[PDB]
Design a protein around this ligand. Structure first.
Ligand SMILES: Cc1cc2nc3c(=O)[nH]c(=O)nc-3n(C[C@H](O)[C@H](O)[C@H](O)COP(=O)(O)OP(=O)(O)OC[C@H]3O[C@@H](n4cnc5c(N)ncnc54)[C@H](O)[C@@H]3O)c2cc1C
Ligand code: HEC
Ligand code: HEC
Lengths: 174, 400
């Protein structure tokens, strides 16, 4: 049976060596929480999460292969990406994250030793985070109701400009 | 302390040298490649279309030297599998315990009557990037508005099945904005081609396909196969007997494994190299592993993602075998992205496994496939951004 590295080293062409992606859009997956990782792979595979290509890829693997790969990626060190951001919007975005998202995305979802099942926002590629929130808003992938209501409350209060601010804040954490 | 020589520093050879050296740094790894700067042919069609600069395709070898690989700029002329020596054009000899051969393709120019290697300086193939990519882009930039561009793919197998058709898309993107009276005519060897339904729909939407003012025409084989050219008159002739005159003609000649694999007795009557798919060891010469375009790894296509995936199998197997360990079970993967225009991209993907007897590679059932024919615009737009991201990531993973 293939080893974790024999399985995961094929992902580097789209996600970068060790899961640190050079962008501009394919996500970094280094240091993801292993339960998060396995669940997202299973949902791409079943089609619960609609995708451009990950359903086609994840369908090629078993549960056991996802759990091996989750171990590999969890052992890597996530590197916040070097990307541009709108520095003028950073303090606004800090306040928005603090008001709407920090409750669950603790320290912006960084892979902290004492958080389980974090979802990394800080230092992730901004186009990927824009596509993910497009997918939540379209219901192309599921979200807990408690994230849905905060996202809806941020948009009702701040508009699209509120999102630009959140993204500049997450990108500034590099 | 054991020795490996890698012949070829393109996507397969650089990947294999990197992944051997990093798995066991005690191995001495020497990579032989004549060109001191590599040009990726992947993404070169965006250079031919105008939205990418040629220098972005360049890759150096300082990333591999930093991993402890010795890089020798010379060509290998022979490999003696019994004494285990790779002999170079410069007259040096490099001993090995295992040898990895990844020399890409030989282009059979003069299979098209009237064409030749020297004449690729007049009708570029640009199936190997660098000056050829520059030549083809300069010809397009100098072409008078109303001029015809021909693309003539060969019969399979060849390097990057969808590549000619991404190329036509990229050339049409350029004509639509800058030379709108022109058109690209694809004269094919084949009755169908890679991602054909998806490309056709995209050309209907972007480029007028199937209308009198189409920027792209496609003619099927076998009638349309280009069998002759006259480079002075700027014509080609098809197998059906039709002449086409053009202002720019991109002939893509048939291909086989690169010359060193032929002269080292690594090929069979297909013109490609048979291997054990668990290890990429040659079925003909023990101790030599063949990867990348040069090998037969059907159904994997001849692509950079496949070469990089095969290299990782071959590297882990060479490292185990040098150590007296058993190579593990392989896993392989491909994806080829095609950019039809800045907001419109498609892809074909697969995940592969050895079959139950370990004798051939197969696609994993109920997996992989192509961007759907009825994919929504959000998918088509994001695919181009993911295609750029694949390019940056595979380049670093291979050479960085
Ligand atoms: C227009 C186009 C579009 C493409 N698009 C895609 C894409 O979207 N996705 C994708 O995955 N692939 C793409 N590819 C394919 C990719 O270019 C090849 O499949 C891949 O580079 C093959 O890797 P390789 O190592 O076999 O050969 P190469 O990368 O060509 O490397 C072979 C190396 O061997 C060296 N060599 C040859 N003979 C000798 C000798 N005697 N001694 C020493 N060294 C020698 C050569 O100088 C060369 O550098 C595309 C190709 C083209 C041309
Ligand atoms: C408040 C403004 C926000 C923002 C901007 C985001 N979230 Fe959440 N989030 C939560 C959980 C459990 C998930 C996983 C969903 C699943 O099962 O797949 C997420 C995911 C995201 C993402 C996707 C990350 C990716 O790597 O794709 C993004 C971009 C996102 N979140 C942003 C949980 C919560 C909450 C829990 C009670 C709350 C509140 C929020 N999220 C709020 C926000
Ligand atoms: C050819 C590109 C490609 C390959 C190969 C690929 N991915 Fe992906 N991956 C994507 C893209 C693009 C996305 C965004 C979703 C989509 O549109 O498919 C993604 C999303 C993901 C995500 C979601 C990240 C998050 O933040 O929730 C995970 C996890 C992931 N991929 C893991 C992998 C693993 C593990 C492999 C390899 C075994 C792999 N991918 C191979 C392109 C690829």
């Amino acid at each position: 049976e293939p080893t974790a590295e024999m399985l995961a080293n094929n992902c580097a062409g789209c996600h970068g060596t060790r899961g640190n992606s050079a962008g501009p859009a394919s996500p970094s997956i280094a240091q993801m929480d292993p339960a998060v990782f396995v669940e997202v792979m299973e949902q791409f595979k079943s089609g619960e999460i609609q995708s451009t290509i990950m359903g086609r890829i994840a369908k090629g693997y078993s549960t056991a292969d996802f759990q091996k790969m989750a171990e590999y990626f969890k052992q890597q060190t996530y590197q916040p990406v070097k990307q541009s951001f709108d520095k003028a919007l950073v303090a606004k975005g800090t306040k928005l994250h603090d008001k709407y998202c920090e409750k669950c995305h603790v320290e912006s979802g960084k892979p902290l030793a004492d958080q389980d099942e974090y979802h990394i926002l800080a230092g992730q590629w901004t186009p990927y985070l824009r596509y993910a929130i497009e997918d939540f808003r379209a219901e192309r992938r599921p979200m807990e109701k408690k994230m849905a209501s905060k996202l809806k409350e941020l948009l009702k209060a701040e508009g699209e400009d509120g999102l630009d601010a959140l993204f500049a804040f997450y990108a500034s954490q590099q | 302390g054991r020795k490996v020589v890698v012949v070829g520093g393109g996507t397969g050879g650089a990947t294999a040298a990197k992944y051997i050296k990093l798995a066991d740094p005690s191995i001495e790894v020497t990579l032989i490649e004549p060109n001191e700067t590599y040009y990726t042919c992947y993404m070169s069609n965006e250079v031919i279309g105008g939205d990418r600069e040629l220098a972005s395709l360049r890759v150096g070898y300082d990333g591999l030297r930093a991993h402890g690989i010795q890089v020798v700029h010379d060509s290998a002329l022979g490999i003696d599998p019994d004494k285990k020596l790779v002999k170079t054009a410069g007259g040096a000899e490099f001993a090995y315990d295992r040898c990895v051969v990844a020399p890409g393709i030989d282009l059979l120019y003069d299979k098209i009557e009237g064409y030749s290697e020297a004449l690729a300086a007049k009708l570029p193939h640009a199936w190997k990037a660098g000056e050829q990519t520059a030549l083809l882009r300069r010809q397009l930039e100098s072409m008078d508005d109303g001029g015809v561009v021909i693309i003539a793919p060969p019969a399979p197998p060849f390097r990057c099945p969808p590549g000619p058709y991404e190329r036509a898309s990229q050339i049409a993107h350029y004509l639509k904005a800058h030379k709108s009276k022109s058109k690209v005519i694809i004269l094919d060897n084949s009755q169908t081609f890679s991602k054909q339904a998806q490309f056709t729909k995209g050309w209907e939407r972007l480029y007028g396909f199937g209308t009198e003012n189409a920027l792209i025409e496609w003619h099927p084989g076998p009638d349309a196969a280009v069998v002759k050219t006259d480079t002075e008159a700027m014509t080609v002739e098809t197998s059906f007997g039709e002449t086409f005159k053009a202002a720019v003609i991109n002939l893509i000649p048939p291909q086989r494994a690169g010359k060193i694999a032929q002269s080292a007795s690594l090929t069979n009557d297909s013109g490609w190299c048979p291997v054990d798919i668990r290890t990429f060891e040659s079925s003909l010469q023990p101790g030599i592993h063949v990867i990348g375009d040069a090998c037969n790894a059907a159904p994997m296509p001849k692509s950079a993602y496949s070469a990089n995936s095969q290299a990782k199998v071959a590297a882990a197997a060479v490292v185990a075998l040098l150590k007296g360990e058993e190579p593990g079970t392989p896993s392989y993967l491909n994806t080829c992205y095609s950019i039809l225009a800045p907001g419109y991209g498609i892809s074909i993907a697969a995940v592969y496994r050895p079959n139950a007897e370990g004798k051939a590679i197969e696609a994993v059932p109920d997996s992989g496939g192509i961007t759907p024919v009825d994919a929504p615009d959000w998918v088509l737009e994001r695919e181009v951004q993911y295609a750029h991201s694949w390019y940056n990531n595979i380049v670093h993973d291979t050479f960085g």
